[model samples]
Target: EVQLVESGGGLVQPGGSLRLSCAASGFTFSNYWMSWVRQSPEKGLEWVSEIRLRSDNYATHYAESVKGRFTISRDNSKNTLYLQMNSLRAEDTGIYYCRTYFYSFSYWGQGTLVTVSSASTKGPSVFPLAPSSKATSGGTAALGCLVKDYFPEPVTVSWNSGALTSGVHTFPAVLQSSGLYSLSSVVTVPSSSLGTQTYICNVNHKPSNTKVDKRVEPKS
Candidate 1:
């Protein structure tokens, strides 16, 4: 059967280093773009990013997200592209899956988990998060929440968190000055806080409240 092979799990510290492999053998590796998806423990899937090997490009539909870190550089000698991450942390703990982004999974690797322990050696990843490690922190970061057909909500900008900072801001959609709609207020805090605390984007429009948070260090 066709398969997407990933290297065994790795354990890294708060500021350590690690590299994993996504090998596609017995199948055509060039026909599709290899995308990496991250699933946090007790949380849902976060589209860290995807790299198109055909053209060597990564795309982002989210603001301040990266379009480069997600890369596919091949070791023609070994016929594999190393899906590696530099610094690691506990917040980076999650199962990662490599699959062709065209649609359904034609080939998939067993989820590889990179557990971030106290041994990590590097500081938290600043925004413009590196391809290898997922960044987590406080303000100066963005929370990606979903509702209905729109997720990571378009035209909505924010930076604050918690009940004290709770409020809703309704405004016209970007590019079009039209009717106003309901949306939770976005909180904006100092950039330094991006890597100092935890901010969550909660999905409240769904049947129940669903939330996903990423701790990050903003680019200096």
Candidate 2:
């Protein structure tokens, strides 16, 4: 079975630009026509643009709405397709996906929600920090998930650890002189399950609709 994987940041600023990608696998990427489509919580579904290669020449098409502001292109060597848009606005906020030929999208990449706003006029940087863990006298354990250097406001954190389910507790994001945010969260687990357990952190911030996932597991 063929698959299309989409990856791109979720945030954009008005007057700024962004690039979205769709990677194809399990089939010849250059053999079919593909398109970038989007859906907004309010506007339903809309076509952004399409691209195909014909007889060694590149052919492209675009929806009237995006004709001037968007560019569609692909890198067959990487089996990847891309969409670039400029002069974005708040109305551009939506979930975007890639689809194959025939209007019957058999293989669709997971849609990514893109948000445009003046609130997050400046984007934030999110990166993982060193995690700390401790073991209790009993069989319980505590693990920390830390992320640093984010901006604007509101970063949410969630956790996942093996079969053990626990509520995720988030700390307040502190304001730094740089006007960015820094925060962390801790999850409790069973010490016996540490070696076999995997911990994941999903952090999300609004206005930009930015979301990221980081994972940690005990080294054998």
Candidate 3:
């Protein structure tokens, strides 16, 4: 079974360019075809472009609406696909997704929302709150990543550690009365996964083109 994951969406200005990424895993990447699709509140659904793998090379095809405005490409070694577009406008505000073709569009990644606005960018404040750990039956513990005070909505949070344990779990961002958003995620690890080692909380705020990394040393 193959899995596709999309990065967080972003904001861009009219006439500006935006790049979106999709990372794929769980199958042979070069053997399959990938496509980019998007939807706006005004437009139901749109097929942007697709990259098809030929014998030893790749060819791209674009829809008439996006033919001249967007470029679709892929990095074979990294199992990633990219969509780049220039000269954006307010009509470009919407969600985008990456899909894989088997017979039909068999798999899809989470949609990333992109907004094109005249408003100035507002970046988020991100930090790692103190983590609480409780021993489990097998001598493992759970850690949490709490991210808060983010604006413009749709921020992406990721966790990285030297070793793979349980997957990073993300909660939906909660909208506050002030219009900012807050989010929390938890991951469980073996007791020995800590010590002088480091755990990282990475937050990507696309509206401001800001990426923040906060590192924490797990207590022994």
Candidate 4:
């Protein structure tokens, strides 16, 4: 019975080392393979690499011919494994999830962001978001899309038809550094001049686009 737990929150900047611990509190840590993954700003998920603690070996890969500058080590006495990802960047702004070789994340942890800048914080802030609301006829509405401990591509906030207009989008040069960028977007949609029409907020990424549509309502 093995489990994996990662660091919490988003990290901002390069120059820092990503130290995540996989807590095998209930199971034997040395008998499993510990792996890391990278979720991009637009491209979907990329598998970074994995290490089998029992053999102290690695099975690694790169994204778009990019290499991962990290190492994995396990402590059987404490039933824990650690991964150190160094030299991060804005592209490293997605969830850094950890998992065991078997099971669909039997014990998974949230990914932390690691940006490239002169800064130091455990991760990005997941609170005090600029709260705003709107009620209008037929025009573009800005929907703020933000996720805790993870960056979502095709970010939610624009699906009212008439061609979508979203803010800036970015990607990582490498897998380990892609999750560092504080990725954000504002989606704009056209409102029906005569009446209210259905609109959807499309947060497109793996698993599927998280759609939240507005049902049509007659003018009051």
Candidate 5:
């Protein structure tokens, strides 16, 4: 499958610099025009920059918003694209993304969380994510927990449902509109054990060195 894996994002202070990397696979990296984007809860999505490196020549287009502060580069040899940010600020905090384009087809990265805060980072906010719920009796269903607003990245979530059974299921953590990272985890449960078993979300956020357990229970 065509994939763009992004990495190298985390906490940074004002005036600091951060470099974000995107490794492209299953496609010809040098053949398409690649772009970088940033999403923030406060301002939505912003175009950062884009570039294309060809054998004889290269072309690039950058958003004025990041013109001088951001740099986009690529290495066709490694099939990787890079975005660099200088003088990072709070306004720059968000989820960073990279995408390749051609023939109306696009490929985006899984995402990278970028945060600009004080020297010391904060812990994430953990809570149960309501199932969009209307309810069902399909014998098996899923439950979710949300983790948000933290930095320096390193967070893990696990489902603990005892014998009720919960195979590990996780979704990519992207930057929330709030300038913080939001990651979600879901656990599958059998309807027969829904009322009898307890579902607890275990969150381990390394930056804050905190372990939080949030219980998801039936309200009705």
Candidate 6:
């Protein structure tokens, strides 16, 4: 039987640091690639970092989002994986997980809860999300937008055309590990309109009195 137990996770304040631990049993820690993953409403599961052992070259890989703020280390003799995340934020609060890669990311450890609280405000980061299978395979197409790093609890999302309101799906902003807020929105449309239609996502940060938009057009 194989199992992993995580410790060193809990509440931390914004701009602080915390170390997480993952101890594996019944496996050789040094022989497999290990990764750290985290989840929150803003983006779902994000690949934080992966450590390759001597079986390869002991090189380290990190997601651009971590930006040198995370340190991953392991004790092969102790069968433990260690993670240190710096400058915690309210946005960083979420479930943290560790995984082992033999052939693929198929094995995982039960997640631990981490919360970053009492963070300050910042301007929202807004952008568009590319279409996916769910948008192309069906008769209908789903377009999306992302809004992040904002404050004042929540922001507003809208489409360019009033007629698109019926298909607009606005999601709530979730606090992220980075100590800000993040959210997503989507608008549905008929696939047949791809060549003849244009769509735009509008995000408004009411408290900041700032607004932003990203435009999209025919699937091309």
Top lDDT hit: 5
lDDT of 6 by residue, 184-210 (tens): 998888887766777888777765677
lDDT of 5 at 135: 56
- Those runs of model 3 whose alpha carbons end farther than 4 Å from true positions after fitting are 123-151, 155-220
Over 26-58, each residue of candidate 5 has an lDDT whose tens digit, in order, gives 987788888998898899988888787685376
lDDT of each: 0.47, 0.72, 0.76, 0.48, 0.80, 0.79
State the lDDT at 79 in candidate 4: 69
Best by TM-score: 5
Point out the higher-scoring one by lDDT: 3 or 4: 3
In model 1, where is the ten-residue run with the lowest total lDDT?
A: 123-132
**Global local distance difference test of model 2:** 0.72
For model 3 the local lDDT of residue 52 reads 88
Q: Model 2 has how many clashing residue pairs?
A: 1
Q: On lDDT, who's better, 3 or 6?
A: 6
lDDT of 3 by residue, 70-117 (tens): 899898899998998888878777889998888565578878888787
TM-score attained by model 2: 0.58
The worst-scoring run of ten residues by lDDT in candidate 5 lies at 129-138
lDDT of 1 by residue, 98-124 (tens): 665445653557777666654322111
Candidate numbers sorted by TM-score from highest down: 5, 2, 3, 6, 4, 1
Sort by lDDT, best first: what order?
5, 6, 3, 2, 4, 1
> How many residue pairs clash (N, CA or C atoms closer than 3 angstroms) in each of the candidate models, in the order given?
16, 1, 0, 24, 2, 8
Comparison by TM-score, 1 against 3, better one: 3
* Off by more than 4 A, model 1: 56-72, 75-77, 102-106, 119-220
